[model samples]
Target: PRYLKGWLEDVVQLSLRRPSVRASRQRPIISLNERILEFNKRNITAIIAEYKRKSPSGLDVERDPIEYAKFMERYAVGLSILTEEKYFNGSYETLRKIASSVSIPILMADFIVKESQIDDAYNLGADTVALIVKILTERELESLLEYARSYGMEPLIEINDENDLDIALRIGARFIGITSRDEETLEINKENQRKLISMIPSNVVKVAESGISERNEIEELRKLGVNAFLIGSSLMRNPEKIKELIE
Candidate 1:
């Protein structure tokens, strides 16, 4: 829980620093599930290309969000901007800039723990936000899900294990993201995706995140009924392959 403690502490400080910020007038949010289904209809796996300055291991993900957005605008079905500043070296400003420049839905991938954080994401031009099920309590998840929808932003409820998946289902989260990497150990296990994909009801949108680098692997996962994929590091290293990867 060391990582979570530091993250919550950061959220508390961020809340105090930006206490006056509130949700602004609503804007049209492009639905991520709709975009995924659009490509899924064509027998293609949707890609949520992520933009970040760096990863947890300090690898450079990208230098500019706008540049990355322009590159993936035509290829990727949606965009995921890493908004966590400390670990991921990302910013909400980056997400705002990319959203204005791109036509696709932008998922605000951050350690969102409070209602105010949801307000900040909406104000920053995010079409959706990432809510990790392992961190927040049932009440926090339920209330945040409701509050996010009120702002017209979909909450991409994230799960790392079966227990987390149960929480997401219990709270009625429609857009569910399954991260292949274990949070505590940072280990990448593709079998985790293979194991949990079938457990999710087909009606719920299943998005596979992390450790997805090969096109063959995507093809295999797509066969298992994953509606979308959230990819970051591999794309950062070889972005030109996005067309090949998505196809």
Candidate 2:
């Protein structure tokens, strides 16, 4: 635990200094606005795809994450790799393998509590990066997102509750994900989801992430004007769930 906390601090420090990172990289920055616009326009769904070696949830979908991408594409789901679990779960080589294989957009998903994770993601050839609203300060998020902007990556900020919405909006972030499961309880609460979305500006594309399953639930959220959904466990367990949600 001590090592994880310290390593994360390093990630934060490393992410803020993008100019230094970009000078060495030969590729362009990853843009979320472009990805989101295309995703919403096509009515594409997002899969919070994971390596799934293990977690507190008792679920492990650790079959190669690259192969998972085919399923993602079949259902028209965008991919977000879950690479951090006490320190990047799926290895760099594994992620690169998947990145090369998948034609769809990818987000480097992890417990990215620090900015340095952006560099980590970029070096791995990721197009998008994720940040949780609960861990960042208002000023920190603004500056970090701007830095990410400089690198040409869109920051897809995730919110666990409604309070996170205001900060995300103030920063003018285009991609926002609302978590239905409480981090503390590991339980889903639609009431919290409803409260959070109700406050968001309609212009900002809203995505529902975490604990989403069943065809009706996704349909319900879509009807409520949430254009995108980030689902994980359900798809891993049943390939048909993807078809059910999207088709």
Candidate 3:
């Protein structure tokens, strides 16, 4: 948490510094909300696979994002591309390339603090965007949520605590991701992760974003009745590992 103060600050500056690349094009939105709704109504297992070339720690790997998104499309209901270039070594170029090539929903993964970034996501062909709750002021989160909505692109509101969840719910978020992303966070907050998963309202699409590498993990999250799981680093490290969660 403490590690993110400067991270968040500089990211906002990075965000605002974005040059007007308004030449970007668009693809009509493909609704992740509808995908989750169908997955719920039919009781299908949905995974939103993520693509990132590097992580601050060990999620780094060399892979063509278009090929990777196409590969993950076979088993995933949606795809997340880390468009945050500074820390994650991701790029808007990679996101646009993958989004134009894939049929499944493309969720832009970024620490979105400004409406301009949402405009970037939309114009770049993202069907959805991720909004991390802990980093933004309540006013920031609420307005950003509404701003993303005005584009008809639903935001996946990510939360780490009850107050985050309350902020999301208060602002009418329909998709919620409760995360414990690495072993350090997972081991320390395992129960809190489950508690947050269990606490999600039924009407919202429940999501578990964790450092999951086992089918047993999926089974447990499914038992908690989560509508989806966003597993990135573990999945990127072993693409075939997706087979374990399929059946």
Candidate 4:
């Protein structure tokens, strides 16, 4: 698909924009892992609702990120801001805007191919960032994880299969995300998500991303010990359902 390739090319090109050193002046970050753990202790799902103007499938989700950010702050435990520009219609400007306006911990969702991008995320006020195992070499994954942590931004190491899971565990990732949606094929496999979650040790914070919509689905995943949920398209389709679907 043109959308997928275009976005991938964007990741490569954006990586060359030069890493900024201005992130050192930003405020101390809030811990997303600790927040989810707190929600787990309370026996509730910590919703990490996403903000994007469109989805990978080309669904329109046009909304002011500030408005979306504030709404989620009232109902969700944290926020995930999509910074990919083409397919998702997101930018660092939006992340910065939402970060400045909201108090909740924000995770920057992007392709994140380079370590410098991790620095960019922190400079833009992201409390955490998503590191997809599919796109990164094991060396890149390890380096990015350390890079994100060096800036006090937690890397939500995302995995779609056992190989990714192995790398995440080997590196002792503090937070691991099991994604139901396959980025390359754009397919949702809920069973794969469950299977991956079952293998995660109890020490790591578990987050289920994509393919979730209803309250019952959340309940099912919660039963598997998923401490957090990263919901995007479903909530984008109907923002009002967030309260009903989560609580």
lDDT agreement with native, every candidate:
0.81, 0.67, 0.80, 0.83
lDDT of 3 at 225: 76
Which stretches of model 4 miss by more than 4 angstroms? 1-25
Q: Give the TM-score of candidate 2.
A: 0.82
Using lDDT as the measure, name the better of candidate 1 and candidate 2: 1
Which 10 consecutive residues of model 3 have the lowest summed lDDT? 181-190
Model 3 ranges off by over 4 Å: 1-6, 24-26, 182-188
Candidate 4 structure quality by residue, lDDT tens digits, 1-247: 0123544656656644634445443567998989888988887668999888877677786787888888889888899998877677888889888999988898999878777677778888889999988777788788888888888777899999899899899987979999988887778898888999999998889999987888898898888888888898887777788889767
Ranking by lDDT: 4, 1, 3, 2
**Candidate that would win on lDDT:** 4
* Residue 200 CA displacement from its true place in model 4, Å: 0.8
lDDT of 3 by residue, 1-247 (tens): 1134445667766866765346456568999878977876787778889898887555668988877888987889899899888777899888888988988898999877777788888888899899888777888888888898899988999987788878888888898888875322333365787988777788888778867678788888888878888888888888888867866
* Cα lDDT of model 2 by residue, 109-129, tens digit: 765545666777777777888
Candidate 4 overall lDDT versus native: 0.83
Weakest 10 consecutive residues of candidate 4 by summed lDDT: 1-10
Those runs of model 1 whose alpha carbons end farther than 4 Å from true positions after fitting are 1-27
Which residues of candidate 2, in runs, are more than 4 Å off? Answer: 1-33, 43-51
145-215: candidate 1 lDDT, tens digit per residue: 99999977778899988889888999998999999987656777777767888899999998999988889
TM-score for each predicted model, relative to the true structure: 0.91, 0.82, 0.91, 0.92
